Amino acid sequence: QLEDLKQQLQQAEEALVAKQEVIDKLKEEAAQHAIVMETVPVLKAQADIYKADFQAERQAREKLAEKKELLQEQLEQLQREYSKL
Amino acid sequence: EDLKQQLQQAEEALVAKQEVIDKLKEEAAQHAIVMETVPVLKAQADIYKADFQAERQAREKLAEKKELLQEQLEQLQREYSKLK
């Protein structure tokens, strides 16, 4: 006749929570997905700070490097005069 | 008494729940793509930190040579004017 009038819940509830399955499975996948998502803003942060820091170190080296040969241009002309002893 | 006045709820939740299953899949999507951003972001970090450490090396290393260089220009200024 029709025994699935109020017997088709026997399939509705059998999927109804084989779907909160996926919601909980997914939800914990989401947990670890957002943990690795925590990686990138820092990795971005490290790149852009270490580039700036590298540039500052170049600059400061440069600033030092001029003095190294400026000061060594003086040892060539003072030492030439310590040649006629 | 068979008035399924509650299968209309045994599906208003089923629907909500595959609704949420899908919101998750699109959320899981945008994650899975940005997860690709990482070998690149690591590669740049890895390098900007390696090179930055290297410049500190040469800056340090250069600062040392420079201070031996004033040690030669000084001990020479006491030595050239000890004569004159």
PDB file of all heavy atoms in Angstrom, chain B residues 20-50:
ATOM      1  N   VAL B  20      25.730  23.903   5.301  1.00  0.00           N
ATOM      2  CA  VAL B  20      26.971  24.126   6.018  1.00  0.00           C
ATOM      3  C   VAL B  20      28.090  23.252   5.455  1.00  0.00           C
ATOM      4  O   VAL B  20      29.248  23.667   5.386  1.00  0.00           O
ATOM      5  CB  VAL B  20      26.729  23.856   7.505  1.00  0.00           C
ATOM      6  CG1 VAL B  20      28.012  23.421   8.132  1.00  0.00           C
ATOM      7  CG2 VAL B  20      26.190  25.109   8.148  1.00  0.00           C
ATOM      8  N   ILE B  21      27.783  22.020   5.091  1.00  0.00           N
ATOM      9  CA  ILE B  21      28.775  21.228   4.388  1.00  0.00           C
ATOM     10  C   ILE B  21      29.323  21.987   3.175  1.00  0.00           C
ATOM     11  O   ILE B  21      30.516  21.905   2.872  1.00  0.00           O
ATOM     12  CB  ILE B  21      28.193  19.842   4.071  1.00  0.00           C
ATOM     13  CG1 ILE B  21      28.270  19.013   5.353  1.00  0.00           C
ATOM     14  CG2 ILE B  21      28.977  19.140   3.011  1.00  0.00           C
ATOM     15  CD1 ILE B  21      27.177  17.998   5.529  1.00  0.00           C
ATOM     16  N   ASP B  22      28.515  22.818   2.526  1.00  0.00           N
ATOM     17  CA  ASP B  22      29.029  23.454   1.313  1.00  0.00           C
ATOM     18  C   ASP B  22      29.813  24.704   1.653  1.00  0.00           C
ATOM     19  O   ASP B  22      30.919  24.885   1.156  1.00  0.00           O
ATOM     20  CB  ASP B  22      27.912  23.804   0.333  1.00  0.00           C
ATOM     21  CG  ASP B  22      27.228  22.584  -0.209  1.00  0.00           C
ATOM     22  OD1 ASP B  22      27.790  21.494   0.008  1.00  0.00           O
ATOM     23  OD2 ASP B  22      26.143  22.693  -0.830  1.00  0.00           O
ATOM     24  N   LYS B  23      29.292  25.535   2.550  1.00  0.00           N
ATOM     25  CA  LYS B  23      30.069  26.657   3.050  1.00  0.00           C
ATOM     26  C   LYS B  23      31.439  26.191   3.475  1.00  0.00           C
ATOM     27  O   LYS B  23      32.441  26.874   3.258  1.00  0.00           O
ATOM     28  CB  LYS B  23      29.350  27.297   4.230  1.00  0.00           C
ATOM     29  CG  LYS B  23      29.371  28.785   4.257  1.00  0.00           C
ATOM     30  CD  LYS B  23      28.014  29.293   4.794  1.00  0.00           C
ATOM     31  CE  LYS B  23      28.005  29.730   6.285  1.00  0.00           C
ATOM     32  NZ  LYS B  23      26.679  30.332   6.714  1.00  0.00           N
ATOM     33  N   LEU B  24      31.508  25.034   4.102  1.00  0.00           N
ATOM     34  CA  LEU B  24      32.814  24.524   4.465  1.00  0.00           C
ATOM     35  C   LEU B  24      33.655  24.255   3.230  1.00  0.00           C
ATOM     36  O   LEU B  24      34.781  24.736   3.126  1.00  0.00           O
ATOM     37  CB  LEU B  24      32.664  23.276   5.310  1.00  0.00           C
ATOM     38  CG  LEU B  24      32.255  23.695   6.706  1.00  0.00           C
ATOM     39  CD1 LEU B  24      32.172  22.491   7.546  1.00  0.00           C
ATOM     40  CD2 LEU B  24      33.230  24.660   7.270  1.00  0.00           C
ATOM     41  N   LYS B  25      33.096  23.552   2.243  1.00  0.00           N
ATOM     42  CA  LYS B  25      33.874  23.247   1.042  1.00  0.00           C
ATOM     43  C   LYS B  25      34.389  24.490   0.344  1.00  0.00           C
ATOM     44  O   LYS B  25      35.507  24.473  -0.159  1.00  0.00           O
ATOM     45  CB  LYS B  25      33.076  22.405   0.046  1.00  0.00           C
ATOM     46  CG  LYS B  25      32.772  20.977   0.499  1.00  0.00           C
ATOM     47  CD  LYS B  25      33.084  20.066  -0.684  1.00  0.00           C
ATOM     48  CE  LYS B  25      33.021  18.586  -0.343  1.00  0.00           C
ATOM     49  NZ  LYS B  25      33.105  17.697  -1.559  1.00  0.00           N
ATOM     50  N   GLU B  26      33.674  25.606   0.406  1.00  0.00           N
ATOM     51  CA  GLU B  26      34.220  26.774  -0.265  1.00  0.00           C
ATOM     52  C   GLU B  26      35.221  27.460   0.630  1.00  0.00           C
ATOM     53  O   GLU B  26      36.266  27.922   0.166  1.00  0.00           O
ATOM     54  CB  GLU B  26      33.111  27.778  -0.601  1.00  0.00           C
ATOM     55  CG  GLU B  26      31.858  27.172  -1.226  1.00  0.00           C
ATOM     56  CD  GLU B  26      30.560  27.930  -0.841  1.00  0.00           C
ATOM     57  OE1 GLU B  26      30.623  28.868  -0.005  1.00  0.00           O
ATOM     58  OE2 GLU B  26      29.463  27.579  -1.353  1.00  0.00           O
ATOM     59  N   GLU B  27      35.005  27.380   1.923  1.00  0.00           N
ATOM     60  CA  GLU B  27      36.021  27.815   2.850  1.00  0.00           C
ATOM     61  C   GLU B  27      37.282  26.959   2.724  1.00  0.00           C
ATOM     62  O   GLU B  27      38.375  27.489   2.551  1.00  0.00           O
ATOM     63  CB  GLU B  27      35.386  27.735   4.224  1.00  0.00           C
ATOM     64  CG  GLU B  27      34.446  28.867   4.452  1.00  0.00           C
ATOM     65  CD  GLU B  27      34.151  29.049   5.892  1.00  0.00           C
ATOM     66  OE1 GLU B  27      34.915  28.503   6.722  1.00  0.00           O
ATOM     67  OE2 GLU B  27      33.100  29.647   6.191  1.00  0.00           O
ATOM     68  N   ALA B  28      37.140  25.626   2.777  1.00  0.00           N
ATOM     69  CA  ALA B  28      38.253  24.696   2.546  1.00  0.00           C
ATOM     70  C   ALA B  28      38.950  24.966   1.234  1.00  0.00           C
ATOM     71  O   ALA B  28      40.111  24.567   1.062  1.00  0.00           O
ATOM     72  CB  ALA B  28      37.797  23.237   2.590  1.00  0.00           C
ATOM     73  N   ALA B  29      38.212  25.497   0.249  1.00  0.00           N
ATOM     74  CA  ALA B  29      38.774  25.843  -1.058  1.00  0.00           C
ATOM     75  C   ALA B  29      39.786  26.970  -0.927  1.00  0.00           C
ATOM     76  O   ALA B  29      40.993  26.757  -1.080  1.00  0.00           O
ATOM     77  CB  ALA B  29      37.675  26.261  -2.049  1.00  0.00           C
ATOM     78  N   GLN B  30      39.291  28.160  -0.569  1.00  0.00           N
ATOM     79  CA  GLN B  30      40.157  29.323  -0.484  1.00  0.00           C
ATOM     80  C   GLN B  30      41.348  29.060   0.413  1.00  0.00           C
ATOM     81  O   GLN B  30      42.419  29.640   0.223  1.00  0.00           O
ATOM     82  CB  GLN B  30      39.350  30.515   0.022  1.00  0.00           C
ATOM     83  CG  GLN B  30      37.977  30.594  -0.624  1.00  0.00           C
ATOM     84  CD  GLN B  30      36.968  31.362   0.214  1.00  0.00           C
ATOM     85  OE1 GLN B  30      37.124  31.506   1.437  1.00  0.00           O
ATOM     86  NE2 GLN B  30      35.914  31.845  -0.436  1.00  0.00           N
ATOM     87  N   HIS B  31      41.208  28.169   1.372  1.00  0.00           N
ATOM     88  CA  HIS B  31      42.378  27.811   2.152  1.00  0.00           C
ATOM     89  C   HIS B  31      43.348  27.068   1.254  1.00  0.00           C
ATOM     90  O   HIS B  31      44.476  27.511   1.038  1.00  0.00           O
ATOM     91  CB  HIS B  31      41.960  27.004   3.386  1.00  0.00           C
ATOM     92  CG  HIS B  31      41.137  27.823   4.343  1.00  0.00           C
ATOM     93  ND1 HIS B  31      39.938  27.382   4.869  1.00  0.00           N
ATOM     94  CD2 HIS B  31      41.289  29.101   4.775  1.00  0.00           C
ATOM     95  CE1 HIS B  31      39.412  28.337   5.619  1.00  0.00           C
ATOM     96  NE2 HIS B  31      40.210  29.390   5.577  1.00  0.00           N
ATOM     97  N   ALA B  32      42.861  26.015   0.602  1.00  0.00           N
ATOM     98  CA  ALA B  32      43.728  25.137  -0.165  1.00  0.00           C
ATOM     99  C   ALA B  32      44.530  25.892  -1.218  1.00  0.00           C
ATOM    100  O   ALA B  32      45.606  25.430  -1.609  1.00  0.00           O
ATOM    101  CB  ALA B  32      42.897  24.020  -0.801  1.00  0.00           C
ATOM    102  N   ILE B  33      44.038  27.056  -1.684  1.00  0.00           N
ATOM    103  CA  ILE B  33      44.769  27.846  -2.692  1.00  0.00           C
ATOM    104  C   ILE B  33      45.852  28.702  -2.027  1.00  0.00           C
ATOM    105  O   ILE B  33      47.022  28.721  -2.444  1.00  0.00           O
ATOM    106  CB  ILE B  33      43.813  28.700  -3.579  1.00  0.00           C
ATOM    107  CG1 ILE B  33      43.112  29.849  -2.831  1.00  0.00           C
ATOM    108  CG2 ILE B  33      42.797  27.816  -4.329  1.00  0.00           C
ATOM    109  CD1 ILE B  33      43.680  31.218  -3.129  1.00  0.00           C
ATOM    110  N   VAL B  34      45.487  29.382  -0.941  1.00  0.00           N
ATOM    111  CA  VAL B  34      46.454  30.183  -0.231  1.00  0.00           C
ATOM    112  C   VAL B  34      47.500  29.282   0.374  1.00  0.00           C
ATOM    113  O   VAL B  34      48.630  29.701   0.552  1.00  0.00           O
ATOM    114  CB  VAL B  34      45.757  31.018   0.854  1.00  0.00           C
ATOM    115  CG1 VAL B  34      46.751  31.879   1.566  1.00  0.00           C
ATOM    116  CG2 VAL B  34      44.669  31.848   0.247  1.00  0.00           C
ATOM    117  N   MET B  35      47.194  28.008   0.592  1.00  0.00           N
ATOM    118  CA  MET B  35      48.226  27.117   1.093  1.00  0.00           C
ATOM    119  C   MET B  35      49.356  27.012   0.069  1.00  0.00           C
ATOM    120  O   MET B  35      50.469  26.610   0.429  1.00  0.00           O
ATOM    121  CB  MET B  35      47.646  25.712   1.315  1.00  0.00           C
ATOM    122  CG  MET B  35      46.324  25.570   2.121  1.00  0.00           C
ATOM    123  SD  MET B  35      45.995  25.742   3.893  1.00  0.00           S
ATOM    124  CE  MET B  35      46.954  24.354   4.518  1.00  0.00           C
ATOM    125  N   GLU B  36      49.082  27.346  -1.207  1.00  0.00           N
ATOM    126  CA  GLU B  36      50.118  27.339  -2.250  1.00  0.00           C
ATOM    127  C   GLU B  36      51.103  28.509  -2.130  1.00  0.00           C
ATOM    128  O   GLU B  36      52.254  28.413  -2.581  1.00  0.00           O
ATOM    129  CB  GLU B  36      49.472  27.356  -3.634  1.00  0.00           C
ATOM    130  CG  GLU B  36      48.910  26.024  -4.132  1.00  0.00           C
ATOM    131  CD  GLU B  36      47.810  26.227  -5.176  1.00  0.00           C
ATOM    132  OE1 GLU B  36      47.375  27.391  -5.372  1.00  0.00           O
ATOM    133  OE2 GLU B  36      47.389  25.226  -5.803  1.00  0.00           O
ATOM    134  N   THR B  37      50.651  29.624  -1.556  1.00  0.00           N
ATOM    135  CA  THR B  37      51.426  30.822  -1.285  1.00  0.00           C
ATOM    136  C   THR B  37      52.654  30.565  -0.404  1.00  0.00           C
ATOM    137  O   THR B  37      53.457  31.490  -0.211  1.00  0.00           O
ATOM    138  CB  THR B  37      50.519  31.833  -0.615  1.00  0.00           C
ATOM    139  OG1 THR B  37      50.992  33.144  -0.841  1.00  0.00           O
ATOM    140  CG2 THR B  37      50.623  31.672   0.856  1.00  0.00           C
ATOM    141  N   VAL B  38      52.823  29.359   0.147  1.00  0.00           N
ATOM    142  CA  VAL B  38      53.812  29.128   1.200  1.00  0.00           C
ATOM    143  C   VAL B  38      55.196  28.783   0.682  1.00  0.00           C
ATOM    144  O   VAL B  38      56.155  29.350   1.215  1.00  0.00           O
ATOM    145  CB  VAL B  38      53.355  28.029   2.169  1.00  0.00           C
ATOM    146  CG1 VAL B  38      54.561  27.330   2.796  1.00  0.00           C
ATOM    147  CG2 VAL B  38      52.585  28.646   3.285  1.00  0.00           C
ATOM    148  N   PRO B  39      55.401  27.917  -0.315  1.00  0.00           N
ATOM    149  CA  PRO B  39      56.799  27.677  -0.697  1.00  0.00           C
ATOM    150  C   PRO B  39      57.414  28.959  -1.215  1.00  0.00           C
ATOM    151  O   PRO B  39      58.605  29.216  -1.000  1.00  0.00           O
ATOM    152  CB  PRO B  39      56.707  26.583  -1.774  1.00  0.00           C
ATOM    153  CG  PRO B  39      55.349  26.047  -1.687  1.00  0.00           C
ATOM    154  CD  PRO B  39      54.479  27.136  -1.149  1.00  0.00           C
ATOM    155  N   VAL B  40      56.596  29.822  -1.815  1.00  0.00           N
ATOM    156  CA  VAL B  40      57.093  31.103  -2.287  1.00  0.00           C
ATOM    157  C   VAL B  40      57.425  31.997  -1.096  1.00  0.00           C
ATOM    158  O   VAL B  40      58.573  32.409  -0.920  1.00  0.00           O
ATOM    159  CB  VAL B  40      56.082  31.763  -3.236  1.00  0.00           C
ATOM    160  CG1 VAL B  40      56.502  33.183  -3.509  1.00  0.00           C
ATOM    161  CG2 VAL B  40      56.016  30.974  -4.522  1.00  0.00           C
ATOM    162  N   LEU B  41      56.439  32.241  -0.219  1.00  0.00           N
ATOM    163  CA  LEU B  41      56.664  33.035   0.994  1.00  0.00           C
ATOM    164  C   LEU B  41      57.821  32.527   1.839  1.00  0.00           C
ATOM    165  O   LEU B  41      58.491  33.339   2.483  1.00  0.00           O
ATOM    166  CB  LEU B  41      55.400  33.147   1.846  1.00  0.00           C
ATOM    167  CG  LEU B  41      54.668  34.464   1.545  1.00  0.00           C
ATOM    168  CD1 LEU B  41      54.245  34.512   0.100  1.00  0.00           C
ATOM    169  CD2 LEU B  41      53.511  34.782   2.462  1.00  0.00           C
ATOM    170  N   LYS B  42      57.917  31.207   2.059  1.00  0.00           N
ATOM    171  CA  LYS B  42      59.131  30.644   2.665  1.00  0.00           C
ATOM    172  C   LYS B  42      60.387  30.937   1.857  1.00  0.00           C
ATOM    173  O   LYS B  42      61.395  31.385   2.414  1.00  0.00           O
ATOM    174  CB  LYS B  42      59.013  29.144   2.957  1.00  0.00           C
ATOM    175  CG  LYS B  42      60.037  28.710   4.066  1.00  0.00           C
ATOM    176  CD  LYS B  42      59.758  29.217   5.494  1.00  0.00           C
ATOM    177  CE  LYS B  42      60.261  28.244   6.576  1.00  0.00           C
ATOM    178  NZ  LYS B  42      61.321  28.845   7.462  1.00  0.00           N
ATOM    179  N   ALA B  43      60.347  30.729   0.543  1.00  0.00           N
ATOM    180  CA  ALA B  43      61.559  30.966  -0.227  1.00  0.00           C
ATOM    181  C   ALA B  43      62.056  32.392  -0.025  1.00  0.00           C
ATOM    182  O   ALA B  43      63.235  32.605   0.257  1.00  0.00           O
ATOM    183  CB  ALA B  43      61.315  30.668  -1.707  1.00  0.00           C
ATOM    184  N   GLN B  44      61.171  33.377  -0.062  1.00  0.00           N
ATOM    185  CA  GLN B  44      61.676  34.726   0.132  1.00  0.00           C
ATOM    186  C   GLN B  44      62.200  34.958   1.541  1.00  0.00           C
ATOM    187  O   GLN B  44      63.349  35.360   1.700  1.00  0.00           O
ATOM    188  CB  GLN B  44      60.596  35.765  -0.162  1.00  0.00           C
ATOM    189  CG  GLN B  44      60.096  35.818  -1.588  1.00  0.00           C
ATOM    190  CD  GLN B  44      59.033  36.875  -1.758  1.00  0.00           C
ATOM    191  OE1 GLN B  44      58.118  37.035  -0.930  1.00  0.00           O
ATOM    192  NE2 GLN B  44      59.258  37.731  -2.757  1.00  0.00           N
ATOM    193  N   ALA B  45      61.452  34.552   2.568  1.00  0.00           N
ATOM    194  CA  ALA B  45      61.935  34.654   3.948  1.00  0.00           C
ATOM    195  C   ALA B  45      63.297  33.976   4.068  1.00  0.00           C
ATOM    196  O   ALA B  45      64.212  34.489   4.718  1.00  0.00           O
ATOM    197  CB  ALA B  45      60.900  34.107   4.927  1.00  0.00           C
ATOM    198  N   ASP B  46      63.347  32.717   3.677  1.00  0.00           N
ATOM    199  CA  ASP B  46      64.558  31.935   3.840  1.00  0.00           C
ATOM    200  C   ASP B  46      65.770  32.716   3.337  1.00  0.00           C
ATOM    201  O   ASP B  46      66.739  32.954   4.064  1.00  0.00           O
ATOM    202  CB  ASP B  46      64.436  30.659   3.002  1.00  0.00           C
ATOM    203  CG  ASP B  46      64.014  29.444   3.801  1.00  0.00           C
ATOM    204  OD1 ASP B  46      63.524  29.610   4.958  1.00  0.00           O
ATOM    205  OD2 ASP B  46      64.174  28.326   3.238  1.00  0.00           O
ATOM    206  N   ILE B  47      65.613  33.299   2.154  1.00  0.00           N
ATOM    207  CA  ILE B  47      66.652  34.077   1.489  1.00  0.00           C
ATOM    208  C   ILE B  47      66.873  35.444   2.085  1.00  0.00           C
ATOM    209  O   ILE B  47      68.000  35.789   2.403  1.00  0.00           O
ATOM    210  CB  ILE B  47      66.236  34.251   0.029  1.00  0.00           C
ATOM    211  CG1 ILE B  47      66.251  32.910  -0.699  1.00  0.00           C
ATOM    212  CG2 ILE B  47      66.979  35.392  -0.585  1.00  0.00           C
ATOM    213  CD1 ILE B  47      65.680  32.975  -2.098  1.00  0.00           C
ATOM    214  N   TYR B  48      65.824  36.182   2.401  1.00  0.00           N
ATOM    215  CA  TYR B  48      66.106  37.499   2.949  1.00  0.00           C
ATOM    216  C   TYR B  48      66.753  37.415   4.323  1.00  0.00           C
ATOM    217  O   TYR B  48      67.527  38.303   4.688  1.00  0.00           O
ATOM    218  CB  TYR B  48      64.821  38.350   3.034  1.00  0.00           C
ATOM    219  CG  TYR B  48      64.351  38.809   1.663  1.00  0.00           C
ATOM    220  CD1 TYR B  48      63.404  38.088   0.932  1.00  0.00           C
ATOM    221  CD2 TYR B  48      64.771  40.008   1.131  1.00  0.00           C
ATOM    222  CE1 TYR B  48      62.958  38.526  -0.355  1.00  0.00           C
ATOM    223  CE2 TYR B  48      64.345  40.450  -0.137  1.00  0.00           C
ATOM    224  CZ  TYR B  48      63.430  39.727  -0.880  1.00  0.00           C
ATOM    225  OH  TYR B  48      63.022  40.200  -2.130  1.00  0.00           O
ATOM    226  N   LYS B  49      66.475  36.357   5.086  1.00  0.00           N
ATOM    227  CA  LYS B  49      67.175  36.132   6.342  1.00  0.00           C
ATOM    228  C   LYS B  49      68.604  35.608   6.104  1.00  0.00           C
ATOM    229  O   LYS B  49      69.550  36.030   6.782  1.00  0.00           O
ATOM    230  CB  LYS B  49      66.285  35.272   7.260  1.00  0.00           C
ATOM    231  CG  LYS B  49      66.880  34.697   8.585  1.00  0.00           C
ATOM    232  CD  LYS B  49      65.795  33.968   9.434  1.00  0.00           C
ATOM    233  CE  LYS B  49      66.206  32.601  10.033  1.00  0.00           C
ATOM    234  NZ  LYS B  49      65.450  32.201  11.308  1.00  0.00           N
ATOM    235  N   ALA B  50      68.794  34.676   5.168  1.00  0.00           N
ATOM    236  CA  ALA B  50      70.158  34.218   4.880  1.00  0.00           C
ATOM    237  C   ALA B  50      71.056  35.346   4.410  1.00  0.00           C
ATOM    238  O   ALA B  50      72.194  35.472   4.873  1.00  0.00           O
ATOM    239  CB  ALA B  50      70.140  33.125   3.814  1.00  0.00           C
TER     240      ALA B  50
END
